[PDB]
From a paper:
Transcription factors (TFs) recognize specific bases within their DNA-binding motifs, with each base contributing nearly independently to total binding energy. However, the energetic contributions of particular dinucleotides can deviate strongly from the additive approximation, indicating that some TFs can specifically recognize DNA dinucleotides. Here we solved high-resolution (<1 Å) structures of MYF5 and [name] bound to DNAs containing sets of dinucleotides that have different affinities to the proteins. The dinucleotides were recognized either enthalpically, by an extensive water network that connects the adjacent bases to the TF, or entropically, by a hydrophobic patch that maintained interfacial water mobility.
The molecular interactions observed in the structure of [name] bound to DNATT, which showed the next highest affinity in the SELEX experiments, were strikingly different from those of [name]–DNAAC. The extensive water network is lost because of a hydrophobic patch in the major groove, formed by the methyl groups of the two Ts. The hydrophobic contact with Thr285 is replaced by hydrophobic contact between the methyl group (CG2) of Thr278 and C7 of the first T (T7) of TT. Only one water connecting the side-chain oxygen of Thr285 with the side-chain oxygen of Asn282 was observed in the region around Thr285. On the other side, Asn282 is connected to O4 of T7 through one water and to O4 of the second T (T8) of TT through a water chain containing three molecules. Thus, most of the contacts in the complex [name]–DNATT are shifted from the Thr285 region to the Thr278. An additional observation is that the side chain of Arg289 forms a hydrophobic contact with the methyl group of Thr285, in contrast to [name]–DNAAC, in which Arg289 shows two conformations, both of which are turned away from Thr285. The number of low-mobility water molecules observed at the protein–DNA interface was significantly greater for [name]–DNAAC than [name]–DNATT. Consistent with the relatively high predicted mobility of these waters, the level of electron density seen in crystal structure of the [name]–DNATT complex in this region (<1σ) appears similar to that of free solvent at the limit of resolution (1.85 Å), thus explaining why only few water molecules are seen in [name]–DNATT crystal structure at the dinucleotide recognition site. By contrast, the TT dinucleotide exposes a more hydrophobic surface to solvent molecules in the major groove, which leads to a more mobile water network at the complex interface that is entropically more favorable than that of the AC dinucleotide.
Author numbering: 231 to 292
Write the structure that this text describes.
Amino acid sequence: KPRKARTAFSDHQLNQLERSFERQKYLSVQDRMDLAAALNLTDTQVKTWYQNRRTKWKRQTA
DNA sequence: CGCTAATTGCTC
DNA sequence: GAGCAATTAGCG
């Protein structure tokens, strides 16, 4: 059952994703597209990173 | 094993 | 169509 290769984010991409998460828990479609373009990532990579980041946030705080 | 990226299937 | 919970799975 073919799956996508696991993305290895750069330190730069991870730093900028985390900065985005400290500013906003959720992104609008426009904020997601601006962030994907700025980080040379796909819209779905950013969406999924934000979803998995909220899961971790919930576990560590809840 | 632990961290976390990707997948699935459901709610809303 | 975005979120979320449960899950699968890559890599250090």
